[PDB]
Symmetry: none
Subunit: 76 residues, 3 copies
């Protein structure tokens, strides 16, 4: 598990939710973020196996989240 | 006694999943089940099935996210 | 998308946001930066084609981002 990545995921979700003017959970719930911080999905397929992530959420939110995880793992 | 911090997390997760699916919160898990989860902190399929109000159907449908939340809590993650 | 450009775009965004005392997303959101990294817009018209880039933001933040992208694509 990566705690630093989890904090980064929470911050991204907050940014998207604030800009979109929706409660953070409407973007993703905490369990989805935890799995992301565990599985560290970097591809579309990897993202779609994370619970809470359907094709709808993948199109709207997928790129920023994948990019964040990729950058964290690559050490940027 | 149950972990009140975990119960409140489970409550928020349930609200999120229930709102998503457009069902009453109890249709996911009722309050008594959540409290039992906050008491027993189930982390595997077997442990979840030991909890009142959790059968194989609910485990299939809702199990993963709740287990992920409990596992992260018990590890302080 | 170009990952090294995306990194550079994030750094410029952070610098503008820090100076302005705003969260980075308020300058441009993550998805907008990713599209810039994808399409590498150099002209004003190309920049305006990017989601989340209106004329107001262009006047305010446009020139530094255009200069950055151009210097990246050319090897400056």
């Amino acid at each position: 598990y990566d705690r630093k990545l989890f904090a980064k995921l929470r911050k991204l979700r907050k940014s998207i939710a604030d800009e979109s003017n929706v409660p953070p959970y409407v973007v993703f719930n905490d369990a989805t973020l935890i799995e992301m911080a565990e599985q560290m999905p970097i591809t579309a397929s990897e993202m779609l196996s994370v619970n809470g992530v359907g094709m709808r959420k993948l199109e709207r939110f997928g790129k920023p989240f994948m990019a964040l995880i990729r950058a964290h793992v690559d050490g940027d």
